Every structure is written in structure tokens, then in C-alpha cells.
RNA sequence: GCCCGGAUAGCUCAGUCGGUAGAGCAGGGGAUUGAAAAUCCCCGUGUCCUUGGUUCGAUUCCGAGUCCGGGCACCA
RNA sequence: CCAUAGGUUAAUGAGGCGAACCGGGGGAACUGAAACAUCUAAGUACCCCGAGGAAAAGAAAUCAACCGAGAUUCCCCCAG
RNA sequence: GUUUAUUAAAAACACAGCACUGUGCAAACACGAAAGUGGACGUAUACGGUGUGACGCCUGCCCGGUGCCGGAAGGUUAAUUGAUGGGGUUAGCGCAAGCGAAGCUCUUGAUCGAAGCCCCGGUAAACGGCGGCCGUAACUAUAACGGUCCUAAGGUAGCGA
RNA sequence: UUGAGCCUUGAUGUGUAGGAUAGGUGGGAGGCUUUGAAGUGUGGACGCCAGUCUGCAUGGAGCCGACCUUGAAAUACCACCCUUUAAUGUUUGAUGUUCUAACGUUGACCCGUAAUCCGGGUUGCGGACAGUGUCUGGUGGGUAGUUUGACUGGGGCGGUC
RNA sequence: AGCUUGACUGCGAGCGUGACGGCGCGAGCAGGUGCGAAAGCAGGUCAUAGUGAUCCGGUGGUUCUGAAUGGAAGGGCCAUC
């Protein structure tokens, strides 16, 4: 509970996305990190955060 | 309520009719019987929530035929930006250390522009420019390092548009003396602007109703599309 | 229904015309008495002859 | 018996399908109404207990056309 | 899950179509009576639940969120 | 008033019974799901109506798939 | 008087009486899918339900919860009605990516929307409730009395192991 | 006749400094008046009886704007509209009354028929209500089908899973 | 403390522990990255608890299927609620 569940979406044209969780309480800012992408096969920016 | 000079032109427009941008420009020229060159105005009821920051239509646009009027610009820069502002075409160019003198009696202008590194001095005491829409803001396109360009666009015929806290927006688009075709290009120049400034969360028809009018005249329904 | 009138009647008087009247005013007072008749296509032409002839 | 003397419609059995889908036998009692019809070919108020839809069928075909179908199947009015 | 309303001083609550937020309870004291009662008044320790937006200015108006009160929806 | 309702008489037929099969209108529970309501039991038991020697169905507004088949019904596969 | 025929005949039940409440006739109610009938071939001094239980003296305090009888500004709200938006198909237009009229269809569900509930005012001879902690009457003890506990009010008479 | 949406047409806004019952954004240093204005005199009317608008009319040839103030400046004029409100109209509904031809009639009368049933007819009284069918929400032990766990120093309680 | 994202994707011989389901470890290999001069290290956190089987649906991606054909709906697969 409390610690909601989010999902980082690929900034690329791909629809791939990774799942995870964050602390909406003290971390409302939009999360952004560079991870690998099985579709494009290249580390693309991953934003989107609740 | 109204006078004949107003009741005479009212019979020249059909309240229950949505004229076209091409038919509105010609009819508008017949809705100006005043004793002076009236200005063209176009209002529209944006289908957005004016009470939501993420849904505010504000910015600036350059008319393809100007506004047809002189716009005395007053820029406040610092350093070399002072010369670039003067040689640009600005009517008056005061320094940052002499910003209080303008408030005294040297307050005669239509628009004010300033540089980012000079917003902390003009920001304060802006109780005279804010309520008069003369308070420079990076949004209205009156606050940028390239003041030399900003002023040129304003002198060319650039008009600013900002929807009120009710959901309506009105801006000048020239005079009535202008030719029919001319006005059309100017009117469409703005219509395409708002559509570009339309918020992403904006739900429903962004353009609910558009109407043109003069200084001493009535309004006319026109299809923006 | 449409139905044709035979008598005069109120707000529809003409002594012969097709007016969209509710199935209630027709099948209850009009026809069931002698002031209207169902337009079964066989009557619209019947009374039509009365007009010309 | 509550059965239309024209359309022949009669109480059909069914089930009260509730939200939880609980079967419960029931019936759909026809909307019969004893109406007094007049015949111009007999000068009489022939009353017949027919349903709502049964009356409309008499409007198109005709009270005389309906009765003709009754005396044909033994129906007495 | 949807929607409306409520959360205001330590407690119980009144209030505004946008701006010095009051009353009562309690305590100390005062006024009043010759005096003890009563009565009346003064004295206050608030980001008006929390985070933003519009505004010269938000307890208000709007958006999101939380707790709580009412109803409905709710077949993994 | 006409006309009907009604009354009388005559002819014909019907009424009943019956082990099964058949069509149609009605239509469970126990039980199983190791409980239990969806579900299953079952459109089975039973009640009722009608008919025949068979009944019922039946001569495509059906299937198939670009090649055709050609009413319905019954049996065997398809296929547990 | 009646009752567990066949282990209980009793303080149980019934009882005249009294009270509340429902009922204006095609009554309420009851037996029935319906018709119909009973209630009654009666008409509020009637009838049905409930409660108590001759008589005598009397029958208090309390309306929050749960019910019943009414009213009602605002709020929420079913079926029905089907406003917009999106999607599928395709004549045509595009050399192609794509878009795409009419019609049809799927989906999404504004507006129209009464009760009800909440709310508000009553009713306790309705279902029921009618208790806790302290201060005090100048010998003790108790508490006429005065606050509080916010649950609605907190035991009149009489009686009492 | 009227409650609400909708479309034009007209009103409409008393924080404070103050010439004064300032709606917010924009255009805007002039339109307005001899197509007969201020300024006075009345009717109608809004209303916090503060003050203002307006037809008619008297009169007859002016009235204004940063003004020095106000966070924000014009009854100087003109637009897109909200708050509030009024009148035509439009649209979607609501309420009540009148009428009679369905329906109802356990009112009267006649016949079938020396018959309290029933059916037909006539008439009177109600009347598109009532009632009923379908759908829908609420209500619903009157009634029906069931659940309400198991471990456990017997079970229950407690606790546990 | 500086620099950053290996909490990455496709496998993983072999091995441990359970009736099973399941879970755990795993050098190393291939592709694409970060840090360091480099040798190398990184498939979350010292490790061991911080959890929810199935069915039924929603969302995005993938022409795999597309009940006459060409699509679509739906379904299956991957990610995810």
C-alpha cells in the first residue's frame, strides 16, 4: 500500500515499457532513466511516472 | 440602447448565419460607419477551462499585413543590449538604473519589452504595467535576449493573444480600411494560431464560436475552418 | 394513422382529407361513429372518385 | 381463459432471471382488454376480449375480416 | 469506483457571490450591589485537513490527494 | 321496426377404455459439483390434451465454398 | 370455564372490561394466478388486528436507534429517450505512406428521469430504554441540591430479600 | 398557467482612498446631438426607499478622457460573455379544470325468464382517470432454497491458520 | 565522495533442494551499455522474510490466426494491470 505502482514507457516509437513502483508521497517528480529495449535493441529514455 | 448608425448596420448582418472568412471580410468593411479608421477584432469562445493552468492559450503571432497602426515600443535592457535595442527601432530605450524615471512622467507607449537579466528590476513596481497588459513576460514574447528581433516583430504587426479567466479571447488583426482579401489573410493568420496553441487536455470542440467586429460595429459569425 | 374524414369535425375539418391523427381519436370516435375511415389504400382511391366524379 | 380471441396469444411461461441468474418460473400474461367493436354489416356491438396487438390487427384487416376468421374455426361471438 | 458535503481556535459550532474569521464553554480579572448571588464586559495560544492554479489577496472558486459522513455501482 | 339472442324438432358426429411408440401445452426434487445459489440432475419423473398405424418431420429464403451437392427421417463415422 | 386424546389440568389459555390503531363499502382483511366468494345480504354504538385482563386507586420520564404517520429547498438516482466522440467497412482521391463522403454497423452514454435514502417536523397504551463518575446541607452518615459524562432522558407514586 | 435549458432582445453588479449603487478581459482621446442634446418636470420600474435607467414632454445646442487618487477607469461608444433578473419566442416537461365516445358501474329500468347468476339493451353518474399488462427502483422471513469452516489434550470460549 | 544506471535482453552446460507445483545458485557465451588509464566489475541492495495459483477481463505491441474472399472484431503470444 501507499507506495503506488508505475510503469516506465519507452520514449521511442516502440510500445515496450518496464514496470516498477515509486513513492508518490515525497517523489511526485517524473521518473526518467535509461534502460535497454528488446524491440529497438538500444538503450532508450524511459519516462512516465505516477 | 443602440442608435440608428448602429441599427442601420445591424440590418446588414444576419445574426442567425455563419458567414465565411471570405464573406466576413467584405461585410465587415460595411460595418464601420464611424468617423475614424476602426480596427478589426475577432473573438472566440474557446472550449477550454480558463481556470486550469494546463489549459491557457497565451502567446504572440505576426500578422502577414501588420495591424495598420504605429506601436511605440519601450524596451528596458542592460549593457550592449541597450544599443542593439536602439538601432533596432525602439521608440524609447531606458537603462536598468533609470527605470523609475519612466514611472514619473515618461510613461507613453503601447508595449514594453525587456531582457531576462533585467526582469528583477522591472518585475517590481510592475503594478502599473501588469494591470495594463504592459508587464513583459517570457510567455507573451516580450522577454528574450534577442530584444533586437522581438521589437522588430512588434513593429511589423505582431499581436499578442491571451484567453481571459472566463474562456474568451480577443485580439486586433488590423483596420477596416484594409482590403477584403488582406483582412482574410490576417484573420486566418490568427485562427491557425489558436489551433496551434490549443492545450493537450482540451476536450470537446476547441472552436465553439467565432465572430468578427469593428470599433463602432456589431459582430458577425464566421466559420474558422 | 392517416385515415380520411367523411364529416366536418373540429380542427381538421375539410369534409375529405388525409390527416395524421392518433390511432386513439380515430379508432374510438372518428371511425366508430361516422366521421373518418382507415386509409387502407382501397378507400383513398374510392373517395378519390367522389372528388372528380 | 386469458387468451386473445384473435391473435390467439396466451400466457406464456418463462423465468425471472435475476442479477445472480436465479431461475424462477413465471409467465407473460397477455394485455387483453374486453373491447366493444361495432359491425356495419350486422349493426351490433360484438364485444371481444383481445390483446393490445390483437386490436391493431383488426384495424388493418377489419372487424368484419377478423370475425370471418372466427366463425371459420368455431369461434363464437 | 462515481458523486455531494464536512474537517474553522483546546473542545462544541455559526459565517462570506471571491478580502480586518466571530460566539459559546473554561480560567484570571473588572464593572455592578452596602455585601454574597446573579447579570454584562475585557483578556486569545489559527498556515480555517494537505499540495497547486487564478488573483493585489484564498477558510472561500477551481483541480488533484487524504481522513470522515451518506448513497449507489461493484460476476476474477 | 328490421335484425339477432333465445326456444323447439330432425340428421350426423362426438363422449369411453387401452401396455408401448409419437407430437404439443405444464414441468421438479433428490442427487452430482464430495458444502452450496450459477451449473448438473432434465426438458428426465410425473400430470394433461390430441392422433395414427406409424406419428412427427418434410420438397430449401438449407449447406458448401468458387469445385458442387440438392426434401424430411433413420443408422454408422466425423468426435469425445 | 379451556388445555398437552395416552406421565404436565397448573401461576398456562380463555374471560367479560378497558385502550390504541386500521376500515366510508366493490371496506380492511382472507381464500384464490383469475373469476368468484367469505367478511356481510353488515355500515363506525360496525368490523378486523394488537395489548392488557373483574373491580378499586392510577398508569410517570425519554423520540437518538429501529418503525409508523406527513412535509420538503438542495443533492444522488432505474428503465426509457440516444446528444457527442472513437472504431470497422468503402465509392472516390493518391503512382505510395495515408486519408477517406453516403449508407450500414459496433461502441461510448450528455439530456429527460419519480420514488427511495439522507434531511426536517410528530408519534412511546409502538419494538424498547428509564445508568455511570465527583462536589455539597456547620457531629458522623446520607444527598434535598449542583455539574459532568453528549447516549434521549437517568426513577413519580407504590412496592420491595 | 407555469417550472427549467436554448436564441435574440433589455436590465444587472452598493471592498476601501473618492467628482460615484466600478462585472472581468479587449478595441478605444473622441463618438454623441440639429435623423432635434444637457438640464428640469411626471408616469412605469429595479431595489441593500443608496441610487439609477427609460417612453412621453418641457427645453433647446451641449455632454466628455490620463485627470491629483484607485491593485484595476468609465453612463464617452462598441463587442464576445459570466453573476443576477425580466419579457416575447422556441424546445423539453409539469399541474389542474371542462367535455364524452372507450373503460368501470356489487345505481335504476326492460327482455331473454313467475330467476338475487349471467348476457344484451336503455338511462343516470364517473371518465381517458381508475384498473390491468410489461419494464424499473425501492420495499418484502408472508413464503422458499441454503450457508453459517477446521485444527483443538471432548467440544465451546480464547487463540491459532 | 566523483562519475552514472547491469534493477538490461536472448541463453546458460552443470548443479542444489522438493511427491508435485515451485524455488534457488550458476561461471561462462552472444548483442547492446556504464564506470576506470588499465587489469576488470555490474543481470539491484551482505545474504536469508517484505508475499497472492487459476479462471475471467482491461491496455500496448506483434498481420501468428482472420469460420466464402480481402479486412475488421475476437483469440493466441510478449509486456502489464
From Swiss-Prot, chain A:
The domain of life is Bacteria
Gene3D superfamilies given in the database record: Ribosomal protein L33
Alphabetized Pfam families for the sequence: Ribosomal_L33 (PF00471)
GO cellular component terms, semicolon-separated: cytoplasm; cytosol; cytosolic large ribosomal subunit
Q: Which PROSITE patterns match?
A: RIBOSOMAL_L33 (PS00582)
Which Gene Ontology BP annotations are present?
cytoplasmic translation; response to antibiotic; ribosomal large subunit assembly
Regions annotated as coiled coil: none
Q: Which GO terms describe its molecular function?
A: structural constituent of ribosome; tRNA binding
List the keywords (alphabetical): Methylation, Ribonucleoprotein, Ribosomal protein, RNA-binding, tRNA-binding
Asked if the keyword Ribosomal protein belongs to this entry, the reply reads yes
What NCBIfam families does the annotation carry? PRK00595.1, rpmG_bact
Additional notes on this entry: Surface exposed on the 50S subunit.
Q: Which family does it belong to?
A: Belongs to the bacterial ribosomal protein bL33 family.
Subunit structure, interactors included: Part of the 50S ribosomal subunit. Cross-links to the P and E site tRNAs.
Name by which UniProt lists this protein? Large ribosomal subunit protein bL33
Upper taxonomic classification of the species?
Answer: Bacteria, Pseudomonadati, Pseudomonadota, Gammaproteobacteria, Enterobacterales
Gene symbol? rpmG
UniProtKB/Swiss-Prot annotation, chain B:
According to its UniProt entry, the function of this protein is described as: One of the primary rRNA binding proteins, it binds very close to the 3'-end of the 23S rRNA. Forms part of the L1 stalk. It is often not seen in high-resolution crystal structures, but can be seen in cryo_EM and 3D reconstruction models. These indicate that the distal end of the stalk moves by approximately 20 angstroms. This stalk movement is thought to be coupled to movement of deacylated tRNA into and out of the E site, and thus to participate in tRNA translocation. Contacts the P and E site tRNAs. Protein L1 is also a translational repressor protein, it controls the translation of the L11 operon by binding to its mRNA.
- Oligomeric form and interacting partners: Part of the 50S ribosomal subunit. Cross-links to the P and E site tRNAs.
Organism for this UniProt entry:
Escherichia coli (strain K12)
- One annotated Gene Ontology cellular component of this protein: cytoplasm
Q: Which gene encodes it?
A: rplA
Family matches, as InterPro entries: Ribosom_uL1_bac-type, Ribosomal_uL1, Ribosomal_uL1-like, Ribosomal_uL1/biogenesis, Ribosomal_uL1_3-a/b-sand, Ribosomal_uL1_CS
**What is the protein name given in its UniProt record?**
Large ribosomal subunit protein uL1
Keyword rRNA-binding in annotation: yes
PANTHER family attached here?
54S RIBOSOMAL PROTEIN L1, MITOCHONDRIAL, LARGE RIBOSOMAL SUBUNIT PROTEIN UL1M
UniProtKB/Swiss-Prot annotation, chain C:
In terms of superkingdom, the source organism counts as: Bacteria
Homology family:
Belongs to the bacterial ribosomal protein bL9 family.
Q: How does it assemble?
A: Part of the 50S ribosomal subunit. In stalled/collided disomes (pairs of ribosomes where the leading ribosome is stalled and a second ribosome has collided with it) bL9 in the collided ribosome contacts bS6 and uL2, while it contacts only helices of the 16S rRNA in the stalled ribosome; the inter-ribosome bridge thus formed is different from that formed between normally translating ribosomes.
| Functional summary from the UniProt entry | One of the primary rRNA binding proteins, it binds very close to the 3' end of the 23S rRNA.
Would you tell me the protein name for this molecule? Large ribosomal subunit protein bL9
Organism of origin: Escherichia coli (strain K12)
Swiss-Prot record, chain D:
Sorted alphabetically, which InterPro entries does this protein's record hold?
Answer: Ribosomal_bL28, Ribosomal_bL28/bL31-like_sf, Ribosomal_bL28_bact-type, Ribosomal_bL28_sf
- Which key words tag this protein in UniProt? Ribonucleoprotein, Ribosomal protein, RNA-binding, rRNA-binding
Q: Name one GO biological process term.
A: cytoplasmic translation
Instruction: Give Gene Ontology CC terms.
Output: cytoplasm; cytosol; cytosolic large ribosomal subunit
Any one GO MF annotation of this record: rRNA binding
Q: Which family does it belong to?
A: Belongs to the bacterial ribosomal protein bL28 family.
Q: How does it assemble?
A: Part of the 50S ribosomal subunit.
What this protein is called in its record is Large ribosomal subunit protein bL28
* Native organism: Escherichia coli (strain K12)
Q: Which gene encodes it?
A: rpmB
Amino acid at each position: 500500500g501507499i507506495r503506488e505502482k508505475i510503469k516506465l514507457v519507452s520514449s521511442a516509437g516502440t510500445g515496450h515499457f518496464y514496470t516498477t513502483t515509486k513513492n508518490k508521497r515525497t517523489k511526485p517528480e517524473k521518473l526518467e532513466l535509461k534502460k535497454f529495449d528488446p524491440v529497438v535493441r538500444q538503450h532508450v529514455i524511459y519516462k512516465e511516472a505516477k | 440602447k443602440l442608435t440608428k448608425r448602429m441599427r442601420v448596420i445591424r440590418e446588414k448582418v444576419d445574426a442567425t448565419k455563419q458567414y465565411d472568412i471570405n464573406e466576413a471580410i467584405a461585410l465587415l468593411k460595411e460595418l464601420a460607419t464611424a468617423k475614424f479608421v476602426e480596427s478589426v477584432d475577432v473573438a472566440v469562445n474557446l472550449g477550454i477551462d480558463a481556470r486550469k493552468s494546463d489549459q491557457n492559450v497565451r502567446g504572440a503571432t505576426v500578422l502577414p499585413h501588420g495591424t495598420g497602426r504605429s506601436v511605440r515600443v519601450a524596451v528596458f535592457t542592460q549593457g550592449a543590449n541597450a544599443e542593439a535595442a536602439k538601432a533596432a527601432g525602439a521608440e524609447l530605450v531606458g537603462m536598468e538604473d533609470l527605470a523609475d524615471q519612466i514611472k514619473k512622467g515618461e510613461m507613453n507607449f503601447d508595449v514594453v519589452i525587456a531582457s531576462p537579466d533585467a526582469m528583477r528590476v522591472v518585475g517590481q513596481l510592475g503594478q502599473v504595467l501588469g494591470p495594463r497588459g504592459l508587464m513583459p513576460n517570457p510567455k507573451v514574447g516580450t522577454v528574450t535576449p534577442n530584444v533586437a528581433e522581438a521589437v522588430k516583430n512588434a513593429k511589423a504587426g505582431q499581436v499578442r493573444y491571451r484567453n481571459d479567466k472566463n474562456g474568451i479571447i480577443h485580439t486586433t488583426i488590423g483596420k477596416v480600411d484594409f482590403d477584403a482579401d488582406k483582412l482574410k489573410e490576417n484573420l486566418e493568420a490568427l485562427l491557425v494560431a489558436l489551433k496551434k496553441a490549443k492545450p493537450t487536455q482540451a476536450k470537446g470542440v476547441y472552436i465553439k464560436k467565432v465572430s468578427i467586429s469593428t470599433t463602432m460595429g456589431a459582430g458577425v459569425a464566421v466559420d474558422q475552418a | 394513422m392517416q385515415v380520411i374524414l367523411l364529416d366536418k369535425v373540429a380542427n381538421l375539418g375539410s369534409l375529405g382529407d388525409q390527416v395524421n391523427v392518433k390511432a386513439g381519436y380515430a379508432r374510438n370516435f372518428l371511425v366508430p361513429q361516422g366521421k373518418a375511415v382507415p386509409a387502407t389504400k382501397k378507400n383513398i382511391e374510392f373517395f378519390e372518385a367522389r372528388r372528380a366524379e | 381463459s386469458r387468451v386473445c380471441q384473435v391473435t390467439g396469444k396466451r400466457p406464456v411461461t418463462g423465468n425471472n432471471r435475476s442479477h445472480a441468474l436465479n431461475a424462477t418460473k413465471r409467465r407473460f400474461l397477455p394485455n387483453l382488454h374486453s373491447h366493444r367493436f361495432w359491425v356495419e354489416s350486422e349493426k351490433r356491438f360484438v364485444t371481444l376480449r383481445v390483446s393490445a396487438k390483437g386490436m391493431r390487427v383488426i384495424d388493418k384487416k377489419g372487424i368484419d375480416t377478423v370475425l370471418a376468421e372466427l366463425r371459420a374455426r368455431g369461434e363464437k361471438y
